[PDB]
Write a protein that binds this ligand. Structure first.
Ligand SMILES: CC(C)n1c(C(C)(C)O)nc2c(F)cc(-c3nc(N[C@@H]4CCOC[C@H]4O)ncc3Cl)cc21
Length: 263
């Protein structure tokens, strides 16, 4: 074969991910994902090959697609989790947090501009290069709810704002070095969220959903500086705009890119 598996990276629905040697390309390490067997998946791979044409700096490269289906991607040694685990005290430098957030928002804006939603953005799929470059991986194909948006938990809407909530969760975790909302179920997750952001107005609660607003009594919203201690005034504002309950009022990746926090 042209690829030689050396280790298992992970397991997905229904497929395994393997670290492989690209024998025809200098034995470079590659991530091989096998997708089992449709037309929707054919379209999904077509979107991924199209996004590759733009070769965005903040998205993992798709080197090859073979025919059930093998997806060959560039290998990145570490994810944001392993970076946050190994970063020395007192934590990630303020300007490293800033740069990585801009790169994440750049890759996110790229995907949203091409009508692609990640839907499972988490430090495990955010890859960090030896040069410190953020690369998005593990998206475009069809459990941890710590980054799941409230409208996904409530089962009402599944648009792009879902990823911006995950970014707000990730932004907070870059300072904390531990997840912001560590729920253990959809109802626990939403409760743990509303303890911090407060119960939203009745007009901001999704209509025709199973869980009503009155199923929670989180009462008032607490200051974020308590849960994220070293955040600046501008960072606090960007973080709040991401962690907005109502997805229509939540900042977009495009307007987050222009926030004064990045000036
Ligand atoms: C693991 C997970 C995020 N993952 C999943 C599933 C479906 C399991 O969630 N599919 C994945 C996939 F298609 C590719 C990668 C990927 N991984 C690396 N490197 C890894 C990063 C983690 O540390 C070990 C390194 O070797 N480099 C490049 C890519 Cl693109 C990760 C995937």
């Amino acid at each position: 074969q042209q690829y030689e598996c050396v280790a298992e990276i992970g397991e997905g629905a229904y497929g395994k991910v393997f670290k492989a040697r690209d024998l025809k390309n200098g034995g470079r390490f590659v991530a091989l994902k096998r997708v089992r067997v449709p037309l929707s998946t054919i379209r999904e791979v077509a979107v991924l090959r199209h996004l590759e044409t733009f070769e965005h700096p903040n998205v993992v490269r798709l080197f090859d697609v073979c025919t059930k289906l093998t997806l060959v991607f560039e290998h990145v040694d570490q994810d944001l989790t392993t970076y946050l685990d190994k970063v020395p005290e007192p934590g990630v430098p303020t300007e490293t947090i800033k740069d990585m957030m801009f790169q994440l928002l750049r890759g996110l804006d790229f995907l949203h501009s091409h009508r692609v939603v990640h839907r499972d953005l988490k430090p495990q799929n955010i890859l960090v290069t030896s040069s410190g470059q953020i690369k998005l991986a593990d998206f475009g194909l069809a459990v941890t709810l710590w980054y799941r948006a409230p409208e996904v938990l409530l089962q009402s809407s599944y648009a792009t704002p879902v990823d911006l909530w995950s970014v707000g969760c990730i932004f907070a975790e870059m300072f904390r070095r531990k997840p912001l909302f560590r729920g253990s179920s959809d109802v626990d997750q939403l409760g743990k969220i509303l303890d911090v952001i407060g119960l939203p107005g009745e007009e901001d609660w999704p209509r025709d959903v199973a869980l009503p607003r009155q199923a929670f009594h989180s009462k008032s919203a607490q200051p974020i500086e308590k849960f994220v201690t070293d955040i600046d005034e501008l960072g606090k504002d960007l973080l709040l705009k991401c962690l907005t309950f109502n997805p229509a009022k939540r900042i977009s990746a495009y307007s987050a890119l222009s926030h004064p926090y990045f000036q």
